[PDB]
Amino acid sequence: PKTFTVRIVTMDAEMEFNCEMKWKGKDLFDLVCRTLGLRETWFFGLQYTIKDTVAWLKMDKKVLDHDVSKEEPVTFHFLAKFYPENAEEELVQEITQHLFFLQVKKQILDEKVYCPPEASVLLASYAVQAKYGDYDPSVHKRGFLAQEELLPKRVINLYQMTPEMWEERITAWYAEHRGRARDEAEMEYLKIAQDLEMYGVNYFTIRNKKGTELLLGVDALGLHIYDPENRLTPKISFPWNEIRNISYSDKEFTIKPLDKKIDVFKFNSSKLRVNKLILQLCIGNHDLFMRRRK
């Protein structure tokens, strides 16, 4: 056996490959990207969960050196690791937009990203427009969306309405999207979703030097400090162009601002696996940040 079977899962489908026994992360990754027709690769990674902490396939380490569950077939999930500051300008390819659309929609439906009720209905309408094409009362009669996962449970429970009260609302918006192709409807979804507050934010529980539990936020704009009860609005921000360095040692992070008069910010994070993910996310988001502006 010169190869082992790798199962790749995207938001769209699952597929399989033969991974060479000594292939590194970049080898498998490049193969998955060519197969998809995806040239905008900087956004994506290959993910697997072990002990409930997310890990990303390191490009220059052997796939089999990773501690992924090696129960056949070895499985990874193709997912956006980074988000653009503007989807409509940075996502050139249709495959890229479509994968982003599905990953973000899932986030909003699983309530990992907060969405207000009225925007949730508008979001659903573009999703419906994307899946069914133009509205047609002949084909799409009352009840055609009864089995569809369209709204977050929160919005459904917020104001108790029957599915057919929500269908009317989503259908009413649906009818006004007439003429929009799948790719257009999907980009309109992203344009709304990306202005949501929790969009593109990686959250991590941390503690300041006084022992106060807090949330570190890592996104396309920079590092952020949140209160654990408020994931919508960060109390402190450090934009990528305003950080001189980020230091790490023995579970302690030290953010050093560019402004020499601003005091450093220190925090603790207990897990080594999370600390390297944080550092990774820092390097990546900073790189994409500085490239949009080069």
């Binding site: 360095n245 230091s247 790490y248 040692s249 790189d287």
Partner: peptide
Amino acid sequence: EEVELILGDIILSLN
């Protein structure tokens, strides 16, 4: 548009 990761215990220099 670049970064440099360096041991000492690691320091992430951002430009």
